[PDB]
Amino acid sequence: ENLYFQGASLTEIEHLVQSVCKSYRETCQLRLEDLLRQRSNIFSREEVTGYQRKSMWEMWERCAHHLTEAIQYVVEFAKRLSGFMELCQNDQIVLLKAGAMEVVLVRMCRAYNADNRTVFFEGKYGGMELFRALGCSELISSIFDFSHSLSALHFSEDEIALYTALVLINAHRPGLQEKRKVEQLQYNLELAFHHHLCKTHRQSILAKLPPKGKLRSLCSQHVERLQIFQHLHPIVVQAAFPPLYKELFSGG
């Protein structure tokens, strides 16, 4: 079914590095240079007040739409990753349901400016106060703290590519039917990531990567806050939340 479901040679691992980085480049959503250039475009006090005056439901709908757009690029990244399309449909869906949001949270560090603690949102950069109408300040604070931590690593785009491929191809996800196939693909992607780090004298970032429990806790908090919002505005979720968002986070 795929070369990377068995033992891969050093030459095949070098091919895997190139292939992952290419798949990431073609699905990164926004170019890094385009995000860095826009750092000087910052929401004014008046604009921040405008976002804070939005209703909780309108802010939740807007943020769910933006997360769904980011998730669609991650689905395409997964489809282009060596071996992913050769997994059975059950497993492709298990990996995407568990890992798409984790990949989005990692990619988000590219849009976060640690100099002023702001994130790109709807054309400009804003602090966590921009999202106060959501009524989930712990979750926003946790996401900003996470982005701040990854921003201190100074990830290159190729490092984000290799790291997010591994975030997705995780053989420990519950529900996997072909667990051994996923383990071998994960082993080869782990060699590709570690080979690239070795070659670029960046192996010191491995001990600094966040624990898997950290990405899990953020995803769990997101689902918990969505459940709370859904109890308050069930018809908003039913009528105006994106279908893909509901499939991933509310079971339909």
Partner: peptide
């Protein structure tokens, strides 16, 4: 009962 994932996966 939203099932967009299988559609995105199957679309080539």
């Amino acid at each position: 009962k939203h099932k967009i994932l299988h559609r995105l996966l199957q679309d080539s």
